[PDB]
């Protein structure tokens, strides 16, 4: 039973380690999505200007 | 191409979560395989004890694994729904946004013209209007103000910690039972060893 | 070699990690390795009930459970690959054992498998000069010794 | 009102699927509860046989139930995605459709 409990604790520790990189990657992706959207909107606002 | 890139990124996140669950699963199934078959060595070792241990470890998938899987599935569902929202309000409706903003500026131009009393588009205005049509206030809020992916990840982490704690409590029950047996044995031993009285 | 273990443990095969969990690497000799390999799913109950097999497994520090048997077989086969402990003499011993256990599949796998680098005499010289260095260090720190 | 009605209908379908799985689950868990504890009657009966039966029936969740649950979850996912599609292309974009056609 102690072995099983130790395995669980090890898994928790590994998750806590990996979330450091994981959350920051997710934040980066958030920012990337927003900037892709803004680039699309900039292109469309450029071409609406043509179109004048 | 942009939409495909974002889809790939979403897939990446889901894959990472799946990998976490798979790690845990591998460990738990190895435990099950080892202890569903452990057999007593020499007589006096309580056959029933070992049998019950074997049964418990056999059921250990149900005991330790399935809730984590359910949590993973829920998180995946939420991620997929968020991607669906981003797709259908932005990365497909760009044509519609173009038509709407373009026609709005056309109507504004003609309204300007209808001032025939001798008493027209800026680029910044166009950019803001196209941004509004693409729902980028809503997606700014969902990407940065209340980051959805980050929320999902924290949900996964916090609930998996809760599950681990519950499993630990459940196992503490088993250890307590074993402790009962141990205490009985030690009582007998101390009784034997203190009969010099 | 998961296909091999499915072949020899068709339904009683368990969830197991294919690497040598071995702790000593000299834990058992080659005849005992051959005996352990010949615990095919058709003889396994008889072997487990056999007193001499139980004595052997107590000598080796094994159980008579199925999972530990399969794990030990895995480790034996990985040592046969990597540390390259077994010759064709392992195959000899399995042919000898075929009096009891008609273990053809493991025999064929041992036959048709890229073996490894051998590297014996270099390892001998390394270990011997390790021991020479230890002897020198002992000499440093008494005259009789 | 129309959108809420459709949402309720979708919920209904999902609920029916869940009920099916729950039926099966109830039966499977009753089997598990009965036969994880069956104990031999007579001197000459195989204690080991019964022990192995007890372990197997205890493992019967993993054995008989989980695949069905996974299938149910898959179906629910797809249903929710379809409702989202219908919502976001029709029952919210009616304003946009009006503006565009007008």
Residue numbers in the entry:
A (entry chain C): 305 to 356
B (entry chain C): 408 to 526, 534 to 611
C (entry chain A): 1 to 141, 144 to 147
D (entry chain D): 408 to 509
Quote from the publication:
Here we structurally and biochemically characterise the DLP pair from Campylobacter jejuni. The respective proteins, here called Cj-DLP1 (84.5 kDa) and Cj-DLP2 (71.2 kDa), were cloned, expressed and purified. Both DLPs are monomeric in solution and form a stable heterotypic tetramer, termed Cj-DLP1/2tetramer, with 2:2 stoichiometry when mixed. The tetramer is dominated by a 2-fold symmetry where Cj-DLP2 with its symmetry mate (termed Cj-DLP2α and Cj-DLP2β) form a central back-to-back cis dimer flanked on each side by Cj-DLP1 (termed Cj-DLP1α and Cj-DLP1β). Combined with GTPase activity and lipid binding, we present a mechanism for how the tetramer tethers and bridges distantly opposing membranes.
Crystals of Cj-DLP1/2tetramer bound to GDP and GDP·AlF4¯ were also obtained in the same P212121 space group as for the apo state. For both, the overall model is essentially identical to apo except for the coordination of GDP within the nucleotide binding pockets. Within the GDP·AlF4¯ crystal, no density for the AlF4¯ moiety was observed. Based on the similarity between the GDP and GDP·AlF4¯ electron densities, it is understood that the GDP·AlF4¯ structure reported here is likely representative of the GDP conformation. Cj-DLP1 has a canonical BDLP1-like fold augmented with an N-terminal 119 amino acid globular domain that nestles between the neck and G-domains. For Cj-DLP2, hinge 2 exists in the closed position so that the GTPase domain (G-domain) nucleotide-binding pocket is oriented orthogonal to the neck-trunk long axis. For the back-to-back cis Cj-DLP2 dimer, the dimerisation interface extends along each symmetry mate so that the GTPase, neck and trunk domains contribute to a substantial buried surface area of 5969 Å2. However, the presence of assembly-stimulated nucleotide turnover, which requires both Cj-DLP1 and Cj-DLP2 GTPase domains to be active, strongly suggests nucleotide binding triggers hetero G-dimer formation.
